[PDB]
Design a binder for this molecule. Structure first.
Ligand SMILES: CC[C@H](NC)c1ccncc1
Length: 185
Protein backbone atom coordinates (compact mmCIF):
# COMPACT_ATOMS: atom_id res chain seq x y z
CA UNK A 1 0.00 0.00 0.00
CA UNK A 2 0.94 3.74 -0.43
CA UNK A 3 -1.24 5.13 2.52
CA UNK A 4 1.81 5.93 4.79
CA UNK A 5 1.70 9.71 3.83
CA UNK A 6 -1.77 10.07 5.59
CA UNK A 7 -0.04 9.12 8.88
CA UNK A 8 -1.66 10.73 11.98
CA UNK A 9 -0.22 10.88 15.56
CA UNK A 10 -2.72 8.99 17.73
CA UNK A 11 -2.80 9.29 21.55
CA UNK A 12 -4.97 7.33 23.99
CA UNK A 13 -7.80 9.00 25.98
CA UNK A 14 -7.38 7.94 29.70
CA UNK A 15 -10.97 9.00 30.47
CA UNK A 16 -12.42 6.30 28.13
CA UNK A 17 -10.21 3.46 29.45
CA UNK A 18 -11.52 0.48 31.40
CA UNK A 19 -10.44 1.03 35.02
CA UNK A 20 -7.88 -1.88 34.92
CA UNK A 21 -5.87 -0.37 32.01
CA UNK A 22 -2.45 1.30 32.43
CA UNK A 23 -1.66 3.95 29.81
CA UNK A 24 1.95 5.14 29.47
CA UNK A 25 2.96 8.77 30.27
CA UNK A 26 3.31 9.51 26.49
CA UNK A 27 -0.30 8.13 25.95
CA UNK A 28 1.10 5.82 23.19
CA UNK A 29 1.03 2.42 25.02
CA UNK A 30 -1.66 0.56 26.98
CA UNK A 31 -1.67 -2.75 28.89
CA UNK A 32 -3.96 -4.74 31.22
CA UNK A 33 -3.14 -4.25 34.93
CA UNK A 34 -3.49 -7.11 37.45
CA UNK A 35 -6.08 -4.97 39.44
CA UNK A 36 -8.27 -1.80 39.40
CA UNK A 37 -5.95 1.17 38.69
CA UNK A 38 -7.46 3.48 41.39
CA UNK A 39 -9.38 5.86 39.04
CA UNK A 40 -12.95 7.23 39.57
CA UNK A 41 -15.75 5.80 37.40
CA UNK A 42 -17.31 7.96 34.63
CA UNK A 43 -19.89 7.45 31.84
CA UNK A 44 -17.11 7.30 29.11
CA UNK A 45 -15.27 4.20 30.55
CA UNK A 46 -15.76 0.83 28.86
CA UNK A 47 -17.01 -1.28 31.85
CA UNK A 48 -17.05 -4.93 30.63
CA UNK A 49 -13.93 -5.25 28.45
CA UNK A 50 -10.28 -3.95 28.43
CA UNK A 51 -11.06 -1.23 25.83
CA UNK A 52 -9.90 2.38 25.31
CA UNK A 53 -10.34 5.03 22.58
CA UNK A 54 -7.92 7.37 20.88
CA UNK A 55 -8.35 11.08 21.76
CA UNK A 56 -8.55 12.08 18.08
CA UNK A 57 -11.96 12.42 16.33
CA UNK A 58 -12.19 12.14 12.53
CA UNK A 59 -15.19 13.39 10.44
CA UNK A 60 -13.44 13.80 6.99
CA UNK A 61 -10.28 12.88 5.05
CA UNK A 62 -7.84 10.01 4.93
CA UNK A 63 -6.03 8.82 8.10
CA UNK A 64 -3.41 6.06 8.69
CA UNK A 65 -1.76 4.74 11.87
CA UNK A 66 0.14 1.59 13.03
CA UNK A 67 -0.17 -0.56 16.15
CA UNK A 68 2.37 -3.04 17.60
CA UNK A 69 0.75 -6.35 18.76
CA UNK A 70 3.99 -8.31 19.44
CA UNK A 71 3.56 -11.45 21.61
CA UNK A 72 -0.15 -10.91 22.31
CA UNK A 73 -2.63 -13.81 22.24
CA UNK A 74 -5.81 -11.69 21.99
CA UNK A 75 -6.73 -8.09 20.96
CA UNK A 76 -9.23 -6.07 18.93
CA UNK A 77 -8.20 -3.05 16.71
CA UNK A 78 -9.93 -0.60 14.41
CA UNK A 79 -12.24 2.44 14.62
CA UNK A 80 -15.62 3.12 16.11
CA UNK A 81 -18.29 5.81 16.31
CA UNK A 82 -17.81 8.36 19.09
CA UNK A 83 -21.36 7.34 20.33
CA UNK A 84 -20.77 3.56 20.81
CA UNK A 85 -22.19 1.93 23.94
CA UNK A 86 -19.65 1.92 26.86
CA UNK A 87 -21.56 -0.10 29.57
CA UNK A 88 -22.62 -3.76 29.57
CA UNK A 89 -22.27 -6.51 26.98
CA UNK A 90 -22.18 -5.89 23.22
CA UNK A 91 -20.71 -7.42 20.03
CA UNK A 92 -18.23 -5.65 17.75
CA UNK A 93 -20.16 -5.08 14.50
CA UNK A 94 -20.81 -2.24 12.04
CA UNK A 95 -24.47 -2.26 13.23
CA UNK A 96 -23.15 -1.34 16.75
CA UNK A 97 -20.70 1.28 15.34
CA UNK A 98 -17.43 -0.72 15.15
CA UNK A 99 -15.08 -1.50 12.20
CA UNK A 100 -12.54 -3.91 13.73
CA UNK A 101 -10.40 -7.05 13.33
CA UNK A 102 -9.15 -9.29 16.11
CA UNK A 103 -6.95 -12.17 17.18
CA UNK A 104 -8.57 -14.84 19.41
CA UNK A 105 -7.55 -18.49 20.03
CA UNK A 106 -4.94 -18.60 17.28
CA UNK A 107 -7.34 -17.26 14.54
CA UNK A 108 -7.81 -13.78 13.02
CA UNK A 109 -11.36 -12.56 12.21
CA UNK A 110 -13.04 -9.36 10.97
CA UNK A 111 -15.83 -7.93 13.18
CA UNK A 112 -18.68 -8.36 10.73
CA UNK A 113 -22.01 -9.91 11.88
CA UNK A 114 -21.46 -12.77 11.78
CA UNK A 115 -17.62 -12.60 11.96
CA UNK A 116 -15.47 -13.29 8.87
CA UNK A 117 -12.39 -15.58 8.80
CA UNK A 118 -9.14 -13.80 7.81
CA UNK A 119 -6.36 -15.58 5.82
CA UNK A 120 -2.98 -14.49 7.28
CA UNK A 121 0.12 -16.62 6.40
CA UNK A 122 2.59 -14.38 8.39
CA UNK A 123 1.29 -13.60 11.94
CA UNK A 124 1.54 -9.79 12.19
CA UNK A 125 3.68 -8.01 14.82
CA UNK A 126 2.41 -4.56 13.56
CA UNK A 127 -1.00 -3.69 11.98
CA UNK A 128 -1.65 -0.65 9.74
CA UNK A 129 -5.16 0.92 9.85
CA UNK A 130 -6.38 3.16 7.00
CA UNK A 131 -9.66 5.16 7.10
CA UNK A 132 -11.10 7.03 4.08
CA UNK A 133 -14.06 8.90 5.60
CA UNK A 134 -15.58 10.14 2.32
CA UNK A 135 -15.23 6.77 0.55
CA UNK A 136 -16.64 4.79 3.54
CA UNK A 137 -13.56 2.48 3.75
CA UNK A 138 -11.59 0.97 6.66
CA UNK A 139 -8.61 -1.21 5.64
CA UNK A 140 -6.11 -3.27 7.65
CA UNK A 141 -2.54 -4.07 6.52
CA UNK A 142 0.09 -6.62 7.71
CA UNK A 143 3.25 -4.44 8.23
CA UNK A 144 5.33 -7.62 9.08
CA UNK A 145 4.43 -9.03 5.58
CA UNK A 146 5.48 -5.98 3.44
CA UNK A 147 2.12 -4.20 3.99
CA UNK A 148 -0.11 -7.00 2.54
CA UNK A 149 -3.89 -6.45 2.79
CA UNK A 150 -5.69 -8.17 5.67
CA UNK A 151 -9.26 -6.89 5.28
CA UNK A 152 -11.33 -4.01 3.75
CA UNK A 153 -14.70 -2.86 5.10
CA UNK A 154 -16.38 -0.94 2.26
CA UNK A 155 -19.79 0.78 2.00
CA UNK A 156 -19.25 1.79 5.65
CA UNK A 157 -22.05 3.90 7.21
CA UNK A 158 -19.97 5.77 9.86
CA UNK A 159 -22.97 7.94 10.89
CA UNK A 160 -20.83 10.19 13.13
CA UNK A 161 -17.32 11.15 14.14
CA UNK A 162 -14.85 8.21 14.32
CA UNK A 163 -12.34 7.39 17.08
CA UNK A 164 -9.39 4.95 17.03
CA UNK A 165 -10.47 1.81 18.96
CA UNK A 166 -8.32 -0.65 21.03
CA UNK A 167 -8.90 -3.76 23.14
CA UNK A 168 -5.78 -5.21 24.90
CA UNK A 169 -7.79 -8.39 25.77
CA UNK A 170 -8.06 -10.30 29.03
CA UNK A 171 -5.09 -12.14 30.50
CA UNK A 172 -6.71 -15.28 32.00
CA UNK A 173 -3.87 -17.39 30.38
CA UNK A 174 -0.89 -15.42 31.76
CA UNK A 175 0.30 -15.19 28.11
CA UNK A 176 -1.47 -11.94 27.10
CA UNK A 177 0.10 -9.26 29.38
CA UNK A 178 2.02 -7.46 26.58
CA UNK A 179 0.89 -3.93 25.63
CA UNK A 180 -0.59 -2.45 22.47
CA UNK A 181 1.80 0.30 21.29
CA UNK A 182 1.23 3.10 18.77
CA UNK A 183 4.27 2.92 16.43
CA UNK A 184 6.28 5.99 15.43
CA UNK A 185 5.71 7.74 12.07
C1 LIG B 1 -13.77 -8.10 37.34
C2 LIG B 1 -13.95 -9.16 36.31
C3 LIG B 1 -12.93 -9.07 35.17
N1 LIG B 1 -11.63 -9.54 35.69
C4 LIG B 1 -10.74 -10.09 34.67
C5 LIG B 1 -12.91 -7.69 34.53
C6 LIG B 1 -13.97 -7.26 33.75
C7 LIG B 1 -13.92 -6.01 33.17
N2 LIG B 1 -12.89 -5.17 33.33
C8 LIG B 1 -11.87 -5.60 34.07
C9 LIG B 1 -11.83 -6.83 34.69
Amino acid sequence: HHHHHHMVHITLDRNTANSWLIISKDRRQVRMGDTHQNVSDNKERFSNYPMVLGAQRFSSGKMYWEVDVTQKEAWDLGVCRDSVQRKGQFSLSPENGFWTIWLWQDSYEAGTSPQTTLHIQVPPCQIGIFVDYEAGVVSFYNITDHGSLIYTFSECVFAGPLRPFFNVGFNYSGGNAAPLKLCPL
